[PDB]
């Protein structure tokens, strides 16, 4: 039967290895928000699918020569039909793949410890005692690199100084850096919500710096893009996306 | 070729400019959507003629499947773009091609200040306080179509007594909230506009759903993808945020 290849990436709570006492195979290896979304999308549109982790473990960014990696590259090269992941819809990516409409909203915000006077990005940009950074090569880092807003230009100049020592390789490294040192992590708000539900010592600082979403990636010209968009809108209007987020985000309270 | 842009009078998106003499053409209008059009035209390089939608409607279908409003202007190729607070919904996205969203919103509650009402559940539980929505808009449709028990209950109340709880437009609803014991179900962007200016009113609770306004194009339009990319660029450059601040900022309230 026609089976779509879905590229994705391990990222809590979107895609995680399921825990079992024996080896797992196929789609049963995984669970998480994105698996539930795939199940709902397939139920509406009637397609079969095979989840496959992106081989290089990357979301998708450009090098100096305009060459892409990650899930974006898998779509460009027609090695996957869909990308289902917290793949941020951005200008540079939308030019080379097709995105569905967003299934989740988010903005860049600040993850930091509780109990401090810091209240906004302006509070970080004006000083240098508190170190701050972002995940290297993600859409958050790219936002600061490209911004012409004075405050975010200043922050990029700090972040990019000293061989980019303020950046981190992944979100888990950044979270541990926040917990151990005087460091603030610039992180997508949905991930902050997940983290602060589980670490009562951490909080979001200020509001959202920008406004964007995660969408399902398809190769340019894909006939599934518009169908997936429609299904996402249906799931939103029925309240199902809200229930899915609550299912996977809610912690044990603080 | 010069593009025909369908739109609708709605504060602060599209308003008649103020002048001492008769105005002509695009110079008749000002507002957020006119600023957005100018920025889209600068990026993509098109000329445009703004034309108010002749029947003064956003877009809904009747029992026989015929559409009206700005949606119908696109369907019949009498407009190339629709630039308005036109909510992206399942039923509309099936018949036109929306750009990606340029502004986020959700359904929420406009009510007077100083009361113990705190959520839609508080309204659904009782009958002393009347509540409704604008007739034939996406908000009314959300409640009509919901299967969530609370929203089914509220729709039962809203549609009773020949729909006396509904209003013809937002200004009528705002005046009803101010004068009587009435709560208006309203898109959060409009609530923010109103409460910035009228300190007797407030938003009750949070957002009931999550959606956005998109630029409409006819199915198959080659402009939809280009407009999406331009919107993403404008968001990442902070220009969409500046445009919202320009038109929404009021004095605020204690
Ligand atoms: C720059 O302005 C922006 C950026 C990002 C989203 C947005 O507005 C939304 C918000 C949500 C949303 C949609 C559009 S949708 O109608 O495109 N798909 C369904 N959802 C809900 C599942 C999330 C506006
Ligand atoms: C978890 C990672 C590295 C991803 C998820 N969304 C962003 C993206 O799609 O680029 C990255 C986060 C960020 O850059 O803050
Ligand atoms: C102002 C009006 C009637 C419009 C604006 N967006 C919705 C739409 O596009 O249907 C309507 C508001 C609402 O239904 O609360
Ligand atoms: Cl399957
Ligand atoms: Cl690597
Ligand atoms: Cl490439
Ligand atoms: Cl300092
Ligand atoms: Cl915010
Ligand atoms: Cl023009
Ligand atoms: Cl789209
Ligand atoms: Cl209050």
From Swiss-Prot, chain A:
The modification Phosphothreonine is found at residue 196. It comes from the Eukaryota. Glycans are attached at residues 1, 201. Homotetramer or heterotetramer of pore-forming glutamate receptor subunits. Tetramers may be formed by the dimerization of dimers. Can form functional heteromeric receptors with GRIK4 and GRIK5. Interacts with KLHL17. This is Glutamate receptor ionotropic, kainate 1. Expressed in the olfactory bulb (at protein level). Expressed in subsets of neurons throughout the developing and adult central and peripheral nervous systems. In the CNS principally in the medial amygdaloid nuclei, medial habenulae, pyriform and cingulate cortices, and Purkinje cell layer. Also highly expressed in embryonic and adult dorsal root ganglia. Expressed at high levels in the trigeminal ganglion neurons. Disulfide bonds join 200-254. Residues 117-254 are extracellular. The gene is Grik1. Ionotropic glutamate receptor that functions as a cation-permeable ligand-gated ion channel, gated by L-glutamate and the glutamatergic agonist kainic acid. L-glutamate acts as an excitatory neurotransmitter at many synapses in the central nervous system. Binding of the excitatory neurotransmitter L-glutamate induces a conformation change, leading to the opening of the cation channel, and thereby converts the chemical signal to an electrical impulse. The receptor then desensitizes rapidly and enters a transient inactive state, characterized by the presence of bound agonist. It is found in: Cell membrane; Postsynaptic cell membrane. Belongs to the glutamate-gated ion channel (TC 1.A.10.1) family. GRIK1 subfamily. The chain holds residues 446 to 819 of 949 of the full protein. The postsynaptic actions of Glu are mediated by a variety of receptors that are named according to their selective agonists. This receptor binds domoate > kainate > L-glutamate = quisqualate > CNQX = DNQX > AMPA > dihydrokainate > NMDA.
């Amino acid at each position: 039967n026609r089976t779509l290849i879905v590229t994705t990436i391990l990222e809590e709570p979107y895609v995680m290895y399921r825990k079992s006492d024996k080896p797992l195979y196929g789609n049963d290896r995984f669970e998480g928000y994105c698996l539930d979304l795939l199940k709902e999308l397939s139920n509406i549109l009637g397609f079969l699918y095979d989840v496959k982790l992106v081989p290089d473990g990357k979301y998708g960014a450009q090098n100096d020569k305009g060459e892409w990696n990650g899930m974006v590259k898998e779509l460009i090269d027609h090695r996957a039909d869909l990308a289902v992941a917290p793949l941020t819809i951005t200008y540079v990516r939308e030019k080379v793949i097709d995105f569905s409409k967003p299934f989740m909203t988010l903005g860049i915000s600040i993850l930091y410890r509780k109990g401090t006077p810091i209240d906004s990005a302006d509070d970080l940009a004006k000083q240098t005692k508190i170190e701050y950074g972002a995940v290297r090569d993600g859409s958050t880092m790219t936002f600061f690199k490209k911004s012409k807003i004075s405050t975010y230009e200043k922050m990029w100049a700090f972040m990019s100084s000293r061989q980019q020592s303020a950046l981190v390789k992944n979100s888990d490294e950044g979270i541990q850096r926040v917990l151990t040192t005087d460091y603030a992590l610039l992180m997508e708000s949905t991930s902050i919500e997940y983290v602060t539900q589980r670490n009562c010592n951490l909080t979001q600082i200020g509001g959202l710096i920008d406004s964007k979403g995660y969408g399902v990636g398809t190769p340019i010209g894909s006939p599934y893009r518009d169908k997936i968009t429609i299904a996402i809108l249906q799931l939103q209007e029925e309240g199902k996306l809200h229930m899915m987020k609550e299912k996977w985000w809610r912690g044990n309270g603080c």
